[PDB]
Amino acid sequence: SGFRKMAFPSGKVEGCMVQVTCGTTTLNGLWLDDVVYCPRHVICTSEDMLNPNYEDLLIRKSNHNFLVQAGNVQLRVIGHSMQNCVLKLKVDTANPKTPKYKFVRIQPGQTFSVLACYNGSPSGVYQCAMRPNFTIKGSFLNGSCGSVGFNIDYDCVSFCYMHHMELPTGVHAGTDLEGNFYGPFVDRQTAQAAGTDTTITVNVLAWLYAAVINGDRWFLNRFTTTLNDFNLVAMKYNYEPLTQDHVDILGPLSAQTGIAVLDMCASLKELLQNGMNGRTILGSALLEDEFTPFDVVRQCSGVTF
Amino acid sequence: SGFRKMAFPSGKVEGCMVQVTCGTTTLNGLWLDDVVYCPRHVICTSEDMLNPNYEDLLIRKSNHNFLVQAGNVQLRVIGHSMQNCVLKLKVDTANPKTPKYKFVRIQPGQTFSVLACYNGSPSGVYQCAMRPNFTIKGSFLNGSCGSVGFNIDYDCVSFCYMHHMELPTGVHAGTDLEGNFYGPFVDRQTAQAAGTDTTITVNVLAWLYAAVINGDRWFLNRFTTTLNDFNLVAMKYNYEPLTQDHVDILGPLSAQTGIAVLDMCASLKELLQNGMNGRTILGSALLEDEFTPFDVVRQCSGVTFQ
Ligand SMILES: *[C@@H](CC(=O)OCC)[C@H](C[C@@H]1CCNC1=O)NC(=O)[C@H](CC(C)C)NC(=O)[C@@H](NC(=O)OCc1ccccc1)[C@@H](C)OC(C)(C)C
Numbered sequence A: 001s002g003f004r005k006m007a008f009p010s011g012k013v014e015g016c017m018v019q020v021t022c023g024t025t026t027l028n029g030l031w032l033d034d035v036v037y038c039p040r041h042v043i044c045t046s047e048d049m050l051n052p053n054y055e056d057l058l059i060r061k062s063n064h065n066f067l068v069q070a071g072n073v074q075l076r077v078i079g080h081s082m083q084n085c086v087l088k089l090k091v092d093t094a095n096p097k098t099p100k101y102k103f104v105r106i107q108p109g110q111t112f113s114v115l116a117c118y119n120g121s122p123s124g125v126y127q128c129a130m131r132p133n134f135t136i137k138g139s140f141l142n143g144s145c146g147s148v149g150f151n152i153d154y155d156c157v158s159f160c161y162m163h164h165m166e167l168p169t170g171v172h173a174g175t176d177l178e179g180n181f182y183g184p185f186v187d188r189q190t191a192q193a194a195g196t197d198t199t200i201t202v203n204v205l206a207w208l209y210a211a212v213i214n215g216d217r218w219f220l221n222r223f224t225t226t227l228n229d230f231n232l233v234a235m236k237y238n239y240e241p242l243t244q245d246h247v248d249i250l251g252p253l254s255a256q257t258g259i260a261v262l263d264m265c266a267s268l269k270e271l272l273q274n275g276m277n278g279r280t281i282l283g284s285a286l287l288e289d290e291f292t293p294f295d296v297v298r299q300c301s302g303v304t305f
Numbered sequence B: 001s002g003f004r005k006m007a008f009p010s011g012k013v014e015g016c017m018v019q020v021t022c023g024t025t026t027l028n029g030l031w032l033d034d035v036v037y038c039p040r041h042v043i044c045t046s047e048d049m050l051n052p053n054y055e056d057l058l059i060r061k062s063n064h065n066f067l068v069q070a071g072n073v074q075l076r077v078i079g080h081s082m083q084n085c086v087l088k089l090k091v092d093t094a095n096p097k098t099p100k101y102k103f104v105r106i107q108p109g110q111t112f113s114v115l116a117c118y119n120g121s122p123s124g125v126y127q128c129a130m131r132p133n134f135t136i137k138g139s140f141l142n143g144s145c146g147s148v149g150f151n152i153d154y155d156c157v158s159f160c161y162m163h164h165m166e167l168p169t170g171v172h173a174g175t176d177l178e179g180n181f182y183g184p185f186v187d188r189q190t191a192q193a194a195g196t197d198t199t200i201t202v203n204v205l206a207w208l209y210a211a212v213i214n215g216d217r218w219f220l221n222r223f224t225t226t227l228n229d230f231n232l233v234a235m236k237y238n239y240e241p242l243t244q245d246h247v248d249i250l251g252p253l254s255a256q257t258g259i260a261v262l263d264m265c266a267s268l269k270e271l272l273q274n275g276m277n278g279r280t281i282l283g284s285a286l287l288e289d290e291f292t293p294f295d296v297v298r299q300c301s302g303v304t305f306q
């Protein structure tokens, strides 16, 4: 038993991180097959990050203006191009450690593991969720751009995030590995802000199922609710609306526990209206919303990779 | 900016996980050079769970009673010995993925990453503190024993924990890699309970410093405290006493923020008296105590957001 915020094992992604240098700017790159992917703002000096013209900046660059370091082995760049906000560097050597992988674009509410890297060297791993406002509450300092987020669907690494920037409230924004931003952001240093966020209701409910599975049942009640009357209370507390597809996804957890989805909704409604009353759930004083239903199942059944 | 519970990258440890089987029992083992380390209760049967005599169980085994699988390759066991609560299986092949490593015994309050493993394969990685009562708040199921805890310093892996058991409140207990349990626990299924646990005060202070580094000062106040008066109040909230050594290890964080340690102690006293009143600190509505001063320095910026 026990329930922790748990990242995927990172070994397969560790073997893909490299250091990419253009001029005085150095950040991280992802080395897969014979291409290195990194944020396109690597071709910026500090003096053109306000309104960079990326087409023009790259037009003046040649393959030899890019230094890619994998360990203490340099990888010759033999071609370069942009795809959206990602720079793609073709190198002379296919990564022998390339895992089975795909690029996926995730939706708000979905979680992923982040391998935070500096100078091409992995420094730590943690879980994030893509917020409904398309930011993530990460932990990133200068030099972390190019760090990647990922999930493992047994043996296949699904890359879903590359890190680009930090916003004033200290939350983080980036792209998929095809260079498309999550959220209404741009890769320059003009004023931008995260929108108002909401709580991921289906994840809260999955976390309550995780709570039941771990022996905490004090928040369960014998009341019932319809889907509509719960959504009426939820939005009052700034919760994402609960859909039938959300109810359906919670099916396996409802089956394992014997607590119907609407009955867990009635418990969440009471938790929202009355609070925890000095009690805690799974060590938290807040209702946690960064576990997906599959996150709960993977952890509580000991799924491996 | 930001502040997260952060594990060490698990690849160097993933390369050492193997599966150990003795009879009907399978668990995880740690393969370093030509030795595999696993919990000794792999040799127990259903009749040996309350009062096993491990010496008498182990003398009845040959090398070939132990099957060690690394991937889909069986390693041949060529020697075995018992050291406290761990078994050491000598194998005929050195692990080519062995990192630089050390075995260390950690002190209460220190943290480490756990690689949860089943059948020799990794499931996930998470961060844990050794509680003052010598338990950890992990996530472990049947089959997880032999999973190891570790810290990584400049590509040297310091192994500090091997998992052995769960207690009835849901917390976990285990040994160092020399097989000596943390705390008063034994590898028997006789009734056992963790002692009354306490909050790791120096870690809570480190975390408040993290909050200030990341730009939040709302919880500070104009007061200070003596060390003795702080310890008298904080013990009433089941907080571990703060020592001068703890005050000293907080020196770097104090100097980066301009907040004397005893002044942060005054802030903690008031937070305990008042609670949060609907606010959070670094995203949490309770006082977090599983980040060491070292963890904060590792993860936070070297420049305070003033
Ligand atoms: C990664 C780049 C890198 O690693 O290069 C190393 C040489 C960083 C990651 C940031 C730095 C601090 N924490 C992070 O996660 N990326 C950047 O610095 C971004 C470069 C741009 C060219 C994309 N810049 C920012 O993240 C910037 N945010 C920003 O400008 O957003 C717009 C804005 C909003 C309000 C006011 C002005 C601008 C950061 C650095 O600026 C702050 C003030 C928002 C933190």
Ligand SMILES: *[C@@H](CC(=O)OCC)[C@H](C[C@@H]1CCNC1=O)NC(=O)[C@H](CC(C)C)NC(=O)[C@@H](NC(=O)OCc1ccccc1)[C@@H](C)OC(C)(C)C
Binding pocket: A001, B027, B041, B044, B049, B140, B141, B142, B143, B144, B145, B164, B165, B166, B167, B168, B172, B186, B187, B188, B189, B190, B191, B192, B193
């Ligand atoms: C690893 C080996 C394994 O799976 O073997 C299965 C037969 C597990 C890890 C546990 C399983 C559940 N979560 C974990 O972390 N270790 C064990 O199963 C232990 C084997 C013993 C030979 C050491 N047993 C326990 O962990 C046991 N705890 C226990 O007996 O504590 C003593 C006790 C205290 C009060 C009352 C009775 C016993 C667990 C499995 O038993 C429960 C009922 C306490 C959970």
